[PDB]
Nucleic acid binder design. Structure first.
Lengths: 72, 72
DNA sequence: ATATGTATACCCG
DNA sequence: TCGGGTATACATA
């Protein structure tokens, strides 16, 4: 099924990743497999890959808030 | 005010992380800072679907004949 | 009809 | 609204 995982960041370092163009959908799930298998920490070598990607993120858009109480 | 970031995933390895004991909250956004700091380039996920097909056809073509004349 | 992201009432404090 | 994380409700693609 579809499980909505929500990491209420605003602190750790979420806004940047998506600020560039990756609202963790593929990131989390990717990190997940790695963190899932190894669950601790790993190490690799030089990227050995060219970085030719742009931005212009345009998918995520929402947000609201209206104070009218406090809750008891 | 914090910020809710949610990957509507489940089986994309996400569940496995929290399945252990970490809803990834701290991991996700932390990890992001790493990919947000380094942001080299996303790994374009390629497919593997074929696009070939056959035909093989052979019907027939039959016809009739006529007599006629002129009649005197 | 999904896929994806998000807000929000709730929970305890 | 209070928040992590939730579902659903809702927005958006």
């Amino acid at each position: 099924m579809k499980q909505r995982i929500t990491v209420t960041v605003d602190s750790d370092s979420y806004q940047l990743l998506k600020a560039y163009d990756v609202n963790i959908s593929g990131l989390v799930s990717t990190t997940m497999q790695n963190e899932a298998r190894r669950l601790r920490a790993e190490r690799w070598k030089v990227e050995n890959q060219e970085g030719m990607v742009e931005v212009a993120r345009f998918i995520e858009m929402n947000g609201s808030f209206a104070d009218e109480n406090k809750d008891w």
